[PDB]
Design a binder for this molecule. Sequence first.
Ligand SMILES: [Cl-]
Ligand SMILES: [Cl-]
Ligand SMILES: [Cl-]
Ligand SMILES: [Cl-]
Lengths: 124, 124
Amino acid sequence: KETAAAKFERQHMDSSTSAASSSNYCNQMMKSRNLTKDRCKPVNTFVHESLADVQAVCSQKNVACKNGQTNCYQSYSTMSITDCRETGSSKYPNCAYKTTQANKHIIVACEGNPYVPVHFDASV
Amino acid sequence: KETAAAKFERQHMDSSTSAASSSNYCNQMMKSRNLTKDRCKPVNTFVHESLADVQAVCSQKNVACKNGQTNCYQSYSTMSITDCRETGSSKYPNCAYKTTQANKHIIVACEGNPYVPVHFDASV
Ligand SMILES: [Cl-]
Ligand SMILES: [Cl-]
Ligand SMILES: [Cl-]
Ligand SMILES: [Cl-]
Protein backbone atom coordinates (compact mmCIF):
# COMPACT_ATOMS: atom_id res chain seq x y z
CA LYS A 1 0.00 0.00 0.00
CA GLU A 2 1.05 3.56 -0.64
CA THR A 3 1.94 5.73 2.40
CA ALA A 4 -0.40 8.60 3.12
CA ALA A 5 2.36 11.18 2.30
CA ALA A 6 3.14 9.51 -1.03
CA LYS A 7 -0.53 9.31 -1.96
CA PHE A 8 -0.81 13.11 -1.26
CA GLU A 9 2.23 13.75 -3.52
CA ARG A 10 0.84 11.62 -6.37
CA GLN A 11 -2.70 13.11 -6.19
CA HIS A 12 -1.85 16.80 -5.49
CA MET A 13 1.66 17.86 -6.49
CA ASP A 14 2.66 19.20 -9.93
CA SER A 15 5.81 21.19 -9.44
CA SER A 16 6.97 20.77 -13.12
CA THR A 17 4.83 23.58 -14.41
CA SER A 18 3.87 27.02 -13.20
CA ALA A 19 0.22 26.68 -14.17
CA ALA A 20 -2.06 24.62 -16.34
CA SER A 21 -1.22 25.63 -19.96
CA SER A 22 -4.31 24.24 -21.63
CA SER A 23 -7.91 23.01 -21.14
CA ASN A 24 -6.75 19.39 -21.53
CA TYR A 25 -4.34 19.65 -18.54
CA CYS A 26 -6.75 17.83 -16.23
CA ASN A 27 -7.61 15.00 -18.64
CA GLN A 28 -3.82 14.37 -19.08
CA MET A 29 -2.87 14.65 -15.38
CA MET A 30 -5.85 12.68 -13.97
CA LYS A 31 -4.82 9.85 -16.33
CA SER A 32 -1.10 10.02 -15.70
CA ARG A 33 -1.38 10.18 -11.92
CA ASN A 34 -3.61 7.04 -12.09
CA LEU A 35 -6.72 8.77 -10.84
CA THR A 36 -8.98 7.24 -13.47
CA LYS A 37 -7.94 3.59 -13.22
CA ASP A 38 -11.19 1.92 -12.19
CA ARG A 39 -13.44 4.93 -11.86
CA CYS A 40 -13.13 8.61 -12.65
CA LYS A 41 -12.02 10.46 -9.52
CA PRO A 42 -14.66 13.23 -9.43
CA VAL A 43 -12.64 16.18 -8.07
CA ASN A 44 -8.88 16.69 -7.56
CA THR A 45 -6.60 19.73 -7.08
CA PHE A 46 -2.94 19.95 -8.24
CA VAL A 47 -0.54 22.42 -6.71
CA HIS A 48 2.08 24.06 -8.87
CA GLU A 49 4.71 24.89 -6.19
CA SER A 50 7.70 23.03 -4.97
CA LEU A 51 7.16 20.07 -2.70
CA ALA A 52 9.08 21.90 -0.02
CA ASP A 53 6.74 24.90 -0.16
CA VAL A 54 3.74 22.63 0.19
CA GLN A 55 5.29 20.62 3.04
CA ALA A 56 6.05 23.93 4.75
CA VAL A 57 2.30 24.62 5.04
CA CYS A 58 2.23 22.09 7.94
CA SER A 59 3.97 24.71 10.10
CA GLN A 60 1.83 27.66 8.95
CA LYS A 61 -1.71 28.62 10.13
CA ASN A 62 -3.54 25.95 12.03
CA VAL A 63 -7.27 25.84 11.05
CA ALA A 64 -10.10 23.38 11.31
CA CYS A 65 -10.60 20.91 8.57
CA LYS A 66 -14.09 20.63 7.01
CA ASN A 67 -14.62 17.40 8.92
CA GLY A 68 -13.82 19.05 12.28
CA GLN A 69 -10.39 17.60 12.77
CA THR A 70 -7.76 20.01 14.14
CA ASN A 71 -4.63 19.10 12.05
CA CYS A 72 -5.32 21.29 9.03
CA TYR A 73 -3.15 24.19 8.01
CA GLN A 74 -3.72 27.05 5.63
CA SER A 75 -0.91 28.46 3.58
CA TYR A 76 0.07 31.98 4.37
CA SER A 77 0.54 32.85 0.69
CA THR A 78 -1.56 32.02 -2.32
CA MET A 79 -0.22 29.25 -4.56
CA SER A 80 -0.80 28.37 -8.21
CA ILE A 81 -3.32 25.49 -8.31
CA THR A 82 -5.45 23.72 -10.88
CA ASP A 83 -8.77 22.23 -9.89
CA CYS A 84 -9.97 19.26 -11.99
CA ARG A 85 -13.59 18.24 -11.91
CA GLU A 86 -15.53 15.84 -14.08
CA THR A 87 -17.90 17.37 -16.71
CA GLY A 88 -21.36 16.09 -17.68
CA SER A 89 -19.66 14.35 -20.72
CA SER A 90 -17.55 12.19 -18.42
CA LYS A 91 -18.30 8.45 -18.52
CA TYR A 92 -15.70 5.96 -17.33
CA PRO A 93 -13.45 4.75 -18.93
CA ASN A 94 -13.84 7.91 -20.95
CA CYS A 95 -13.36 10.37 -18.10
CA ALA A 96 -13.44 14.07 -18.99
CA TYR A 97 -12.52 16.99 -16.76
CA LYS A 98 -12.80 20.74 -16.65
CA THR A 99 -9.52 22.47 -15.87
CA THR A 100 -9.71 25.63 -13.66
CA GLN A 101 -6.41 27.40 -12.90
CA ALA A 102 -6.34 29.74 -9.97
CA ASN A 103 -4.07 31.30 -7.31
CA LYS A 104 -5.42 30.43 -3.91
CA HIS A 105 -4.38 29.59 -0.40
CA ILE A 106 -4.29 25.88 0.16
CA ILE A 107 -5.55 23.93 3.19
CA VAL A 108 -3.98 20.60 4.00
CA ALA A 109 -4.21 18.04 6.76
CA CYS A 110 -0.81 17.00 8.21
CA GLU A 111 0.35 13.89 10.10
CA GLY A 112 3.46 11.96 10.98
CA ASN A 113 7.08 12.44 11.72
CA PRO A 114 8.11 14.18 9.57
CA TYR A 115 4.83 16.09 9.87
CA VAL A 116 3.80 16.36 6.25
CA PRO A 117 0.63 16.77 4.14
CA VAL A 118 -1.65 13.72 3.90
CA HIS A 119 -4.86 15.27 2.59
CA PHE A 120 -5.91 18.23 0.52
CA ASP A 121 -8.92 19.80 2.32
CA ALA A 122 -9.72 22.93 0.22
CA SER A 123 -8.43 26.13 -1.37
CA VAL A 124 -9.42 29.62 -0.41
CA LYS B 1 -37.35 21.68 10.18
CA GLU B 2 -35.70 24.16 7.87
CA THR B 3 -35.92 23.48 4.09
CA ALA B 4 -32.67 22.66 2.37
CA ALA B 5 -32.81 25.94 0.32
CA ALA B 6 -33.40 28.03 3.44
CA LYS B 7 -30.59 26.31 5.32
CA PHE B 8 -28.24 27.14 2.35
CA GLU B 9 -29.35 30.81 2.50
CA ARG B 10 -28.81 31.06 6.27
CA GLN B 11 -25.38 29.32 6.21
CA HIS B 12 -23.91 30.81 2.98
CA MET B 13 -25.48 34.08 1.85
CA ASP B 14 -24.33 37.57 2.93
CA SER B 15 -25.51 39.95 0.29
CA SER B 16 -25.50 43.02 2.68
CA THR B 17 -21.81 43.66 2.28
CA SER B 18 -19.35 43.58 -0.58
CA ALA B 19 -16.63 41.85 1.41
CA ALA B 20 -15.60 41.10 4.95
CA SER B 21 -14.48 44.48 6.43
CA SER B 22 -12.61 43.16 9.42
CA SER B 23 -10.91 40.11 11.03
CA ASN B 24 -13.88 39.68 13.39
CA TYR B 25 -16.37 39.25 10.49
CA CYS B 26 -16.46 35.47 10.93
CA ASN B 27 -16.87 35.48 14.72
CA GLN B 28 -19.86 37.89 14.29
CA MET B 29 -21.50 36.07 11.34
CA MET B 30 -21.00 32.50 12.65
CA LYS B 31 -22.79 33.64 15.84
CA SER B 32 -25.56 35.58 14.17
CA ARG B 33 -26.41 32.90 11.62
CA ASN B 34 -26.70 30.41 14.55
CA LEU B 35 -23.76 28.30 13.49
CA THR B 36 -22.27 28.09 16.97
CA LYS B 37 -25.36 27.14 18.97
CA ASP B 38 -24.37 23.77 20.41
CA ARG B 39 -20.97 23.32 18.83
CA CYS B 40 -18.67 25.49 16.75
CA LYS B 41 -19.28 24.77 13.07
CA PRO B 42 -15.67 24.14 11.93
CA VAL B 43 -15.71 25.62 8.40
CA ASN B 44 -18.27 27.81 6.57
CA THR B 45 -18.18 30.08 3.49
CA PHE B 46 -20.33 33.22 3.00
CA VAL B 47 -21.00 34.64 -0.44
CA HIS B 48 -21.22 38.37 -0.91
CA GLU B 49 -23.41 38.51 -4.06
CA SER B 50 -27.10 38.81 -4.52
CA LEU B 51 -29.24 35.77 -3.85
CA ALA B 52 -30.30 35.86 -7.47
CA ASP B 53 -26.71 35.66 -8.70
CA VAL B 54 -26.05 32.68 -6.48
CA GLN B 55 -29.29 30.93 -7.48
CA ALA B 56 -28.30 31.52 -11.11
CA VAL B 57 -25.26 29.26 -10.63
CA CYS B 58 -27.66 26.26 -10.82
CA SER B 59 -27.95 26.89 -14.57
CA GLN B 60 -24.22 27.49 -15.16
CA LYS B 61 -21.42 24.87 -15.53
CA ASN B 62 -22.34 21.40 -14.42
CA VAL B 63 -19.41 19.70 -12.56
CA ALA B 64 -18.97 16.81 -10.20
CA CYS B 65 -19.31 17.41 -6.54
CA LYS B 66 -16.50 16.19 -4.24
CA ASN B 67 -18.70 13.30 -3.15
CA GLY B 68 -19.27 12.16 -6.76
CA GLN B 69 -22.80 13.39 -7.14
CA THR B 70 -23.62 15.03 -10.50
CA ASN B 71 -25.81 18.04 -9.44
CA CYS B 72 -23.04 20.52 -8.71
CA TYR B 73 -22.49 23.69 -10.66
CA GLN B 74 -19.58 26.07 -10.85
CA SER B 75 -20.11 29.76 -11.30
CA TYR B 76 -18.87 31.20 -14.52
CA SER B 77 -17.55 34.33 -12.79
CA THR B 78 -15.63 34.76 -9.59
CA MET B 79 -17.64 36.03 -6.61
CA SER B 80 -16.66 37.81 -3.41
CA ILE B 81 -16.60 35.20 -0.61
CA THR B 82 -15.37 34.94 2.96
CA ASP B 83 -14.20 31.62 4.32
CA CYS B 84 -14.54 31.14 8.11
CA ARG B 85 -12.58 28.44 9.85
CA GLU B 86 -12.01 27.79 13.52
CA THR B 87 -8.55 28.70 14.95
CA GLY B 88 -6.55 26.71 17.52
CA SER B 89 -7.93 29.16 20.21
CA SER B 90 -11.50 28.06 19.51
CA LYS B 91 -13.25 26.20 22.35
CA TYR B 92 -17.03 26.05 22.46
CA PRO B 93 -18.92 28.06 23.67
CA ASN B 94 -16.06 30.42 22.98
CA CYS B 95 -15.75 29.74 19.25
CA ALA B 96 -13.13 31.74 17.36
CA TYR B 97 -12.66 31.93 13.61
CA LYS B 98 -10.16 33.14 11.07
CA THR B 99 -11.69 35.31 8.37
CA THR B 100 -10.26 34.93 4.80
CA GLN B 101 -11.78 37.14 2.08
CA ALA B 102 -11.27 36.10 -1.48
CA ASN B 103 -12.75 36.31 -5.00
CA LYS B 104 -13.35 32.82 -6.27
CA HIS B 105 -15.69 30.76 -8.35
CA ILE B 106 -18.23 28.99 -6.23
CA ILE B 107 -19.45 25.37 -6.54
CA VAL B 108 -22.90 24.51 -5.29
CA ALA B 109 -25.16 21.49 -5.32
CA CYS B 110 -28.71 22.21 -6.62
CA GLU B 111 -32.05 20.44 -6.11
CA GLY B 112 -35.76 21.01 -6.33
CA ASN B 113 -38.30 22.95 -8.25
CA PRO B 114 -37.32 25.73 -8.32
CA TYR B 115 -33.84 24.23 -8.81
CA VAL B 116 -31.84 26.16 -6.28
CA PRO B 117 -28.65 25.78 -4.18
CA VAL B 118 -28.82 23.34 -1.25
CA HIS B 119 -25.15 22.85 -0.45
CA PHE B 120 -21.92 24.76 -0.77
CA ASP B 121 -19.32 22.27 -2.13
CA ALA B 122 -16.16 24.42 -2.61
CA SER B 123 -14.62 27.55 -4.12
CA VAL B 124 -12.03 27.65 -6.83
CL1 LIG C 1 0.28 4.96 -9.03
CL1 LIG D 1 -8.77 17.67 -4.09
CL1 LIG E 1 -31.73 29.93 12.74
CL1 LIG F 1 -18.80 25.89 3.56
